[PDB]
Design a protein around this ligand. Structure first.
Ligand SMILES: NOC[C@H]1O[C@@H](n2cnc3c(N)ncnc32)[C@H](O)[C@@H]1O
Length: 338
């Protein structure tokens, strides 16, 4: 087998001329020439079989991406693995080669307002389809938004995704660990398991703010710091919004804080389009029940140059174990590519 940066990368002979792109916790990413389609592709090596959590996330990613078909969601073109479960140690996911991701782009590039608008449109168009499938992405952030050289945007990494379950969303204070810290909605720390679609809208609002300034809006230094940053900008929640939190530990924590004033969005983002800031405010609303939903966000005036509900498709078929069963499930889910 071919080897890249000291790693077995067993993809031949369809895929040749490999180039290292980036790493993961149990996964290297390379580009490769697809000798059948005569184009360069991205290939992700995944080695999850030693750990049941890894197998969980791998199965979620594969199952969701194989069922979704949308212009703003990365597709799986091919899956490479050994012909038998016994010989299967790694799985390789082949995808369209994307030039960059929004994380890397924001490190060095200022976005025009036209780019911000277009990127946001595409994020929300993809999210409309995800949510229409009753799925929550649950880890939206700039590094999970891939971009090609013409700025087509595709959402990736569904390894943390779940089927929405709003009836079983409530939990206690300071227990929950959903999404990546900077993109985590305030209720995750207060009373929510992150099983409602509003969790993803919050993340999108954080991404929009980061597109406006190239810095994360709520850069909590650790898990407990995150709510400090959110409330330092949004200000103290209203009585009505506190009354919506029945859990006493969560409500009394908020009541224990000194009063904080809202920081106006236009003071934080003095160069931003006022329509963008109006939409930002609606996505970064403290109360998740008052928070804008994805179809309302698409219809917001900021996006009027792009909005077209007939061209914002929804999913046809919404979604309604020891590592050994999970390996067998991954083997079965990848069979169609043999
Ligand atoms: N993904 O995490 C490790 C590295 O792989 C990159 N990547 C993941 N999928 C990719 C894809 N389809 N096309 C191009 N690059 C990709 C990601 O941008 C990061 O730099």
């Amino acid at each position: 087998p071919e080897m890249v940066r000291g790693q077995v990368f067993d993809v031949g002979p369809r895929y040749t001329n490999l180039s290292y792109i980036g790493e993961g916790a149990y996964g290297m990413v390379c580009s490769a020439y697809d000798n059948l389609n005569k184009v360069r592709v991205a290939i992700k090596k995944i080695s999850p079989f030693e750990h049941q959590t890894y197998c969980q996330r791998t199965l979620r990613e594969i199952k969701i991406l194989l069922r979704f078909r949308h212009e703003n969601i990365i597709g799986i073109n091919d899956i490479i693995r050994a012909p038998t479960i016994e010989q299967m140690k790694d799985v390789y996911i082949v995808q369209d080669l994307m030039e960059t991701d929004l994380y890397k782009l924001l490190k060095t590039q200022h976005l025009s307002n036209d780019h911000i608008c277009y990127f946001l449109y595409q994020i929300l168009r993809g999210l409309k389809y995800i949510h229409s499938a009753n799925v929550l992405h649950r880890d939206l952030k700039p590094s999970n938004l891939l971009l090609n050289t013409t700025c087509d945007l595709k959402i990736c990494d569904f390894g943390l995704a779940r089927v929405a379950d709003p009836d079983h969303d409530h939990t206690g204070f300071l227990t929950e660990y959903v999404a990546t810290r900077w993109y985590r909605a305030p209720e995750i720390m207060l009373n929510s398991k992150g099983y409602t679609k509003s969790i993803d809208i919050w993340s999108v609002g954080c991404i929009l703010a980061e597109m406006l300034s190239n810095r994360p809006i709520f850069p909590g230094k650790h898990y407990l710091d995150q709510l400090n940053h959110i409330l330092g900008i949004l200000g103290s929640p209203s009585q009505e919004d506190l009354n919506c939190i029945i859990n006493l530990k969560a409500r009394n924590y908020l009541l224990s804080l000194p009063h904080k004033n809202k920081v106006p969005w236009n003071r934080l983002f003095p160069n931003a389009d006022s329509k963008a800031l109006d939409l930002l405010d609606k996505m970064l609303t403290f109360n998740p029940h008052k928070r804008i939903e994805v179809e309302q966000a698409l219809a917001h005036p900021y996006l009027e140059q792009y909005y077209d509900p007939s061209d914002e498709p929804i999913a046809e078929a919404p979604f309604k174990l020891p590592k050994e069963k999970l390996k067998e499930l991954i083997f079965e889910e990848t069979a169609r590519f043999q």
